[PDB]
Amino acid sequence: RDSGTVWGALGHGIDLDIPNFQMTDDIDEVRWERGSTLVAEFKRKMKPFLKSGAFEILANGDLKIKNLTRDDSGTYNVTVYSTNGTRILNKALDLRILE
Numbered sequence: 001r002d003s004g005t006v007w008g009a010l011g012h013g014i015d016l017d018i019p020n021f022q023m024t025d026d027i028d029e030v031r032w033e034r035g036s037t038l039v040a041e042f043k044r045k046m047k048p049f050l051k052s053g054a055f056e057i058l059a060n061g062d063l064k065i066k067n068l069t070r071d072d073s074g075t076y077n078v079t080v081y082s083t084n085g086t087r088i089l090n091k092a093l094d095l096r097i098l099e
Ligand SMILES: [Ca+2]
Pocket: 015, 016, 017, 018, 058, 060, 062, 063
């Protein structure tokens, strides 16, 4: 029920902040999924998945957008997993991009 909302502008930056989360050693897999597509998935076993240069996984397991766009407007979902491969934190935020 407590997802979250954010306001941004197309063509401008924006960082998707995960509520109550800390990308520390305890965190092994941080996936940034949106709808039926991937945006940025970081796995302790290196070899992550960056949708494109338009994104950058911050040091705190955050999402750094280069230039907002239509496809960027919507609800984002983060699934944080531990080193043991278990579910840690599952969040959902609302990223509204003003055109
Ligand atoms: Ca952040």
